[PDB]
Amino acid sequence: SLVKLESSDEKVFEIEKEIACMSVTIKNMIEDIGESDSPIPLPNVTSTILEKVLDYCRHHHQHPGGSGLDDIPPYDRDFCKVDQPTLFELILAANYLDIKPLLDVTCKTVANMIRG
Amino acid sequence: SLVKLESSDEKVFEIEKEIACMSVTIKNMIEDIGESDSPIPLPNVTSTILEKVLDYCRHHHQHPGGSGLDDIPPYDRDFCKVDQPTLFELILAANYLDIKPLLDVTCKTVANMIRG
């Protein structure tokens, strides 16, 4: 079922429990509380950012990837098309949830822009 | 004893073994290899960056902190005084070594500048 993850902006982001397990932080919370359909608020990540965090996690789970070597998918490129403050917010949320794929891709995005 | 950590720029950064344990990546390497005084090169983080990564880790170990709420220490502020490409390099090295204090502080540095 969908675990209900309210943001700091109180927006309920219902996403599959199996997806929320990729986030080390959310996973560990579910483990300490036990298997609960109880909504887990995240008082750090806002609605606009948690939207893209969990939507990337939808992409990553339903389509095994979230990354590309010489194969740049349309979604994943348009995902990285955010303003520089908003980009740092994606870094904050990815470190807060300790999502290794999201954190690495977002840190590589800025790395490609400054080296390219 | 001091574990000898060569950078990508081949510079030997000898730092206490007990400090290198805060880095999840370096710690796990020491565990797989076993307790060895053998020098561990890091072919990702350069000399200038690994200098500050391990020197922050010196500060963090010898002085329990590396962070401040309303108490901003001189070192920790001058540590964050780096150029924007160099700042992204600190993010890369902190994610590469999976050092939670360093990664969080450096991600908070940019967060304070864009919101302030």
Interface test with B, best of A88, A89, A99 (most B CBs within 10 A): A88
* Sequence-distant (≥ 6) Cβ neighbours of residue B65 within 8 angstroms: B59, B73, B76
Alpha-carbon torsion angle A30, A33, A35, A36, nearest 10: -100
Q: Which helix (H) or strand (E) holds A107?
A: helix A100-115
* DSSP conformation letters of A54-106: HHHHHHHHHTT-S--SS---HHHHHHH---HHHHHHHHHHHHHTT-HHHHHHH
Q: Which residues of B touch A107 (CB under 8 A)?
A: 88, 91-92, 95
Q: How far apart are CA A92 and CA A111, in angstroms?
A: 16
Give the whole-angstrom CA distance, residue A109 versus residue B41.
26
Nearest Cα to Cα of residue A60 among A101, A13, A14, A30: A101
DSSP H helices in chain B:
17-20, 24-33, 47-62, 74-80, 84-96, 100-115
CA distance A113 to B13: 29
Q: What are the sequence ranges of the domains in chain B?
A: 1-116
Who's near B96: CB < 8 A, 6+ residues apart? Answer: B25, B42, B44, B45
Contact B107 A95 (CB under 8 A): yes
Angle at the Cα of A97 (from A85 to A52), degrees rounded to 5? Answer: 50
Architecture, CATH, for domain B1-116: 2-Layer Sandwich (3.30)
Question: Any chain B CB within 8 A of the CB of A103?
Answer: yes
Report the alpha-carbon distance of residue B53 to residue A93 in Å, rounded.
Answer: 22
Q: How far is B107 from chain A (nearest CA, A)?
A: 6
Q: Which residues pair with B16 in a beta bridge?
A: B2
Name the strand (E) or helix (H) holding A28: helix A24-33
Query: Which residue pairs, CB below 8 angstroms and at least 24 apart, start in A66-75?
Result: A66/A101, A66/A102, A66/A105, A67/A101, A67/A104, A67/A105
